[PDB]
Amino acid sequence: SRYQHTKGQIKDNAIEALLHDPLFRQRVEKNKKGKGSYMRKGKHG
């Protein structure tokens, strides 16, 4: 199925417009433990 992208009416490049689109934003994950790992309640209980 289709994808409703950000950049309305992409002209030239058909692949370097989507690279800035939030489909290809940088997925950064969370640490544990690690500079930024506070729980407050974890996955269970």
Partner: protein, 359 residues
Amino acid sequence: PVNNRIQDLTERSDVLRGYLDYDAKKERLEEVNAELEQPDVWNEPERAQALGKERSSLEAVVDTLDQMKQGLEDVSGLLELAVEADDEETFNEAVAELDALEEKLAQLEFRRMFSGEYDSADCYLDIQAGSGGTEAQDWASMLERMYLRWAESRGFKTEIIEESEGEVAGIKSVTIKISGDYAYGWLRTETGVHRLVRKSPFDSGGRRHTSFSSAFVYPEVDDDIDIEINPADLRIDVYRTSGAGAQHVNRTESAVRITHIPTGIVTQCQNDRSQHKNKDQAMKQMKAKLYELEMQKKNAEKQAMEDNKSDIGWGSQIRSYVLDDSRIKDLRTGVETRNTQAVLDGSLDQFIEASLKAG
């Protein structure tokens, strides 16, 4: 001894068979000649020459492989039965049947990955980092080292043209020209988004990132050989100019209208006193207006063709590069490698050659 080519010619003979549906090409061929069993195909020659064009393609594809089917067995069978004799004339006749098969194989190698619209011409990579900060830019330059250590290893020449370096590390963009023979044929399966998962030395937390980078391969071509049209296709009238100052504006036919009937755009000029200068200005003015109708002919194709690439879905995430878990997985062809430090810094022919056989 010579069993290493005998074992090598077998493995690359059936991958051509599997990635063409070797049994099912004769299936279509037996449907082709079934319509040729009817005598009355000759009443429609627009349909008739279409069928015989498809026939010789379906014939010559399977006939290269059906003679290969006996060819793998007997050339081995010439030597594996006369290793009992160990005869030296047998080695002379075995290699004569061999390189013929190796020619039939390699011309069927270069048959499908040939292929179409100046596919053999020289190339341009245009790699970008996109989004993510430094880590996306450090991965845009690892792709730069990866292809420059690949495309130099197969006999091409690298020419860095435009380049945008990072503020701290890596590059923002690079645009190389990679020239050789069949350059674009090896690089047309690279236009996509290369996904990198690792842990940044540039992140302060040492967290795990998932960066993306484009690598847009496009082939070169000549842009414009564009001149004046045939003057029969343009209509030139003259008339009295509209203005004031004297009746000099209203006595002489000093204006000009050049009308281009294959398009229908009307270039006019009233700028000068003399018709010969107005006609000379309006002729050059219309060749500029024939540039723009040919730019807008190109630019509308550039928008319409890549409203399709935009709407493919998932924007071609081709080849996950997951370095922290030490694997790598191509996406449209599914070939997987466990060597990450070999695919980085060269050795991309597991991924390219397996994706030139698939469509």
